[PDB]
C-alpha cells in the first residue's frame, strides 16, 4: 500500500553501497535505517523522497511509480534532511508560515512553544543557536498533517529533554497510522518491538 | 604541373607568402597538439592504472 | 542486436579500437591527396591573387565546426531522451575538437582577410559568428571540467548543448543583421572558382574523417578514464601486462 | 502557494538588501564613467548611448543573477521547494519573476536619471524605458538555465557569465538596434515586436528547462 | 603558512588541469560584447577603449571579489584561518594577492590580444599594460574592505554597499583619463606616478584595516 | 596555576543574561565538558574562550597574560572544532588535512585519516563525501596535532558509535598527558564521572 521499494540498486562513485533492497511499508509503521558512518543511509532516504533518480529499481506509492504520482506524494509527505530547510535571512515566524497553515494562533506560537522556542518568534534565525535552528524545522513537524514523515538526523544538536519531546510526538503519530522513516545515531528510549529496523543489506 | 614552376617560387607564394605559411603552420600545429596530447593521455592513463594496480597489489600483500 | 551491446563499455572500447586505425589511414590519405592536389596542381583567382587558396585552409574546418555542433545535438538530445550516458560522453568527446576547429577557422579567416582589410581583425560577417561558436564550445568545456562528478557533468553538458543549439539560429541571424546595418564587408568567405571546386569537397571529406578519428579516439580516452575500477580495465591491463 | 512563493522570495530578497545595491551602483558606475572618460562632445554620445546603456544593463543583471539560486542550496530550502504540491517550473517562474521585480524594475525606475545623464529626447526616453521593460525579463529568463546548471558548484565567478552571455547576445543586438534607430527619429515598432517575440519565446522555453537543469544539479 | 595559503587559494580557484582558461575567455566575452552593441568601426572603438577595458576589469574584480570572504563564512574555515599561528593581515594579503592572480594576470596576459582586437597602437598597449599592472591590485585592495564588512552582517544596510563600489571613483576615473590622454600622443607618466602612489597606499593600508573589519564582522 | 582562567564573564544578548560572573581556572590535564540547555550559552562560552568574541565584561587569561598580546603563542597551542567543519569542500581530504601542520608524508598522513575511519577515502573529494565523513575529515586532526588545548564544540554529532568510542579513546590518551579538552555534547559520553569535570552554566 504505502511506500514500497523494488530492487533498489544505487551503486555510484565507483563503489556499491547496497543491492536488492525491497522493503515495503504499510500503515502505521516506524522504521530506522541502520548503518555506519559512510554507509549510505541518506542516499536511500533521498531516493525515497524522489530527489535522486534511482540507478535500478523503483519506489512505489499506492502501486504507482513516483514520477507520475508526485502531486499526492508531495501532498502527503514532509522531509527533513541534514540541511535545515529554512531561510536564514528571515525570522522564525514567517519561516514557519512558509509551510502550510500556521498563521492564526490555532497553530501559531504553540507549535513553537512546544518545541522549546516559546518567546522566540520575531527573532531572526542566526540570532538563535543551531539547535533551535533545527527546532524551527522540527516545530514545522508539529503543525503538519502529512501522513509520511521522513527525517534524516532529527536528533542533531538537540537537548536531552528535546529527545523525549520529539519521541513522544513521534510515537503519537505512530498510533494513528503514521508512517515515519528516520535516520539517527543516538539510541532511542523506545522498546525494540515498536520500531522496525530496515537494515541496509551490505 | 603546378602554377609555380620553381621550388623556391612555390615557397614564395605569389608575393603573399607570409600570410599563407602562417595560416599553414597555425593550422598544422593545433592538430598536432590535439593528437599528441590526447594519445599521451591514453598512454599515461593506461600506465596510470597499471602502476596503481601494482601499488594496490603491494599493499594487499602488505 | 549490436546497438544494445554497444552500450557495454568494454565492447564499445573494442569496437572503437577496431575502428580507429583504418579510418585514420583513410582520413590522412584523403587529407594529403586534397591538400597536395589543391595547393599544387590547380590555378588561382584573378582578383584575390595567390593567397586565394586559403579558401582550402578555412572552409572545410569552419563548416564542420558548425557541423560538429549539430553532432552535439544528436548526442545530447538523445542523451536526454533515453537518459543514456553513452550518448552524453560524446558531448565531451566532440567539444575540444570543435573548439580547435573553430579556432583554426578564426585564425584562417583573420589571416585571409589581411590583404583586403589591412588589419588582422576587423568586425565583419561570419567571423563574429565563428567567435560566438567558439564561446559556446568554451562554455561546454568549462561546464564539463567544472563538475567533480562525471554523470552530473554529462547531463549538465547535455542541457547546455541543447540550450545552445536552440539559441544558435537566433545568433546566426542576429549577427548577420548586425552586418546588414553598421556598414558592410567583402565576400571573402566562399568566392569559389569552377576549376577550383573539387579538392574543396575532398578536403571537406578529409576534415570530416579526421574529426571522426579524433572523436573516436577521444571517446576511447574518456571511456578508459571514467571507469577506473571496473574489472574489464583489469582484464585489458592484464592483456597489456 | 504560487503567490506565497512569490511574496516569500520578494521578502527574502528585500531582507538581503546589500546584493540589491551592487548591480544598481554598477549600472550607475558604467553610465557615469563612460561619457566622463571619453569626453563631453555630444556628437558621439548620441550613438554610444544605446550600446553603453544596454551593456551596463546586461552586466548588472549578470551581477544580480548569482543570488537567484546560489543561496537556496546552501540553506537547503530548494530541496523543500521542489517538494511543495505544485510543479517545479512554476516555482522557477515565480522565483525569476521575483528576481526581475527586485532588481530589474529599479533599472526602469532609475532610467529617468540615466536618460538625463547623457542627453536623449522624450521619444528616445520612451523607447529606452520600453526596451528595458521588454528586455530585462528576457535577460532573466535567458540567464536562469546557466544559474540552474551552476547550483551545486561553489564557483561564483566567470563560469555563469560564460554560460549566459552568448545566449543573450541577440537580445543585446536587437535592443541596441532599436534604441539606435529610435535616436534617428525613425519608427521602431517592428524592433519592439521582435523584442516582444523574444520575450514570449524565453517565457515559453526557459522555465521548462531551468527546472530540468535544477533537478540535474541537485542529485 | 603564507605561501601555503597562497597555494591553497590557487588550488581552490583552479580545480582541474585545464581550468585557467576561464578568466581568459570571460575577458574576450566582454571585449566582444562592447563592439557588438556600440559598433564595428575601429575609430570609435579606439576612442572608447579605456571604458571598455576598465569596465571588463571592474566586472572581473567585483565578480571574483565575493569568493574572497562569502565562501569562507558558510564553509566556516575563516574562523580557523583567524586561529592560524600567523597574523590576520598577512593572511588577508595572501588571499587578495591570490585573487589578483585570478584576475590581474589574465588582464596582463590578454592585453596584446585585446589591443589587437579593439584598434590601438604599441604605445597605447604599453600604457594599458603598465596601468593594469599598477591598478588591478588597487582594485582588489579597495574592494575587499567592503566585502569584509558585508558578508559578516545580519542587520546590514544599503549604506554598507556604499563602502565598496562607490570607492571605485578615483582609480577608475584617473586610469580612464590616463588611457584617454595616451590615446593621443601625449606624456602620460604624470598619472602613472599617481596610480603607483595609489598602489603603495593601498598596499600599506588595505590588510591592516581589513583584518580589523574581519574581526568586527564575525563575533 | 592554571593556564586558562575565565574571569567574571558577562554575556547579554537581547535583554537576556546568558551568564554573569562565570569564573573557572583549568589546571593541566583535565576534561571540562560544558553543559547547558538548547538556548543557553555553551557555544558563546567556548567561542569567547578562543578569543574570537570580545567579552562584554571579564576576560580570558592564558599563562598569566590576557588574550590580546600573546595571540601568537595562544594560536600555536590550540585546536578549535566548531559546528561548521572548517574544511574546503571542493578539494579532497588529503590537501584539506595538509593545510594544517604535519600531514604530507606517511608518518603523519595516510594513518591519521585511517584512524578516524576513512581508510580508502583519502583522495576522494569532500563534495561526494558523506556528512558524517565530512565531519570525520575535520575530526581526524586530533591524531596528528600536538596542540595542548582542544576546544571542540559538538564533536560527536552525525558519527556512529564506533567513531564516538575511538574519539573518546583518543581524547582519553590526550587527557592522561598534559592537555585540556573542552567539549560540549548533548548525549552522555561513555566515560566515568570521576575524571570528567562539569562546569555548568549559572544564571
Ligand atoms: N549520489 C551518490 N550516489 C552514490 N554514492 C554516493 C553519492 N554521494 C556520495 N556517495 C558515496 O557513498 C557514500 C555516501 O553515501 P551517504 O552519504 O548516503 O552515506 P551516509 O549515510 O550519508 O553517511 P552518514 O550515515 O554518515 O550520513 C560515501 O562513501 C560517498 O563517497
Ligand atoms: N552571536 C549570536 N548569534 C546568535 N544568537 C546569539 C548570539 N549570541 C547570543 N545569542 C543568543 O544566546 C543564546 C545562546 O547562544 P548559543 O549559540 O551559545 O547557544 P548554544 O549553546 O550554541 O545552543 P546549542 O546548544 O544549540 O548549540 C541563543 O538563544 C541566542 O539567541
Ligand atoms: Mg547522512
Ligand atoms: Mg553551539
Author numbering:
A (entry chain A): 2 to 203
B (entry chain D): 2 to 63
C (entry chain C): 3 to 243
D (entry chain B), E (entry chain b): 2 to 220
F (entry chain a): 1 to 203
Provide text from the study.
Here we report cryo-electron microscopic structures of the heme translocation complex CcmABCD from E. coli, alone and bound to the heme chaperone CcmE. CcmABCD forms a heterooctameric complex centered around the ABC transporter CcmAB that does not by itself transport heme. Our data suggest that the complex flops a heme group from the inner to the outer leaflet at its CcmBC interfaces, driven by ATP hydrolysis at CcmA.
No heme was bound in this sample, and we obtained one data set that contained CcmA without and one with bound ATP, with only minor changes to the overall conformation of the complex. The binding sites for ATP were located close to the interface of the CcmA dimer, with residue S130 from the other monomer involved in the coordination of the ATP phosphates. ATP bound to its canonical position in this class of proteins, with the P-loop cradling the triphosphate near the switch I and switch II regions and the lid loop. Only upon binding of MgATP the conformation of the P-loop changed substantially, including in the lid loop where H83 coordinated the Mg2+ cation. Unexpectedly, the overall stoichiometry of the CcmABCD changed for the E154QA variant, in that the closure of the core ABC transporter Ccm(AB)2 consistently led to the loss of one copy of CcmCD, resulting in a Ccm(E154QAB)2CD complex. In contrast, the observed conformational change of the outer protomer of CcmB in the ATP-bound state or the E154QA variant complex implies that an adjacent CcmC protomer would have to either dissociate from the complex or change its own conformation in response. It seems feasible that such a rearrangement results in the effective ejection of the CcmCD module from the complex, and it is quite remarkable that it occurs only in one protomer of the CcmB dimer, while the other almost completely retains its open-state conformation with CcmCD in place. The model had the core ABC transporter Ccm(AB)2 in a closed state, very similar to the ATP-bound E154QA variant complex.
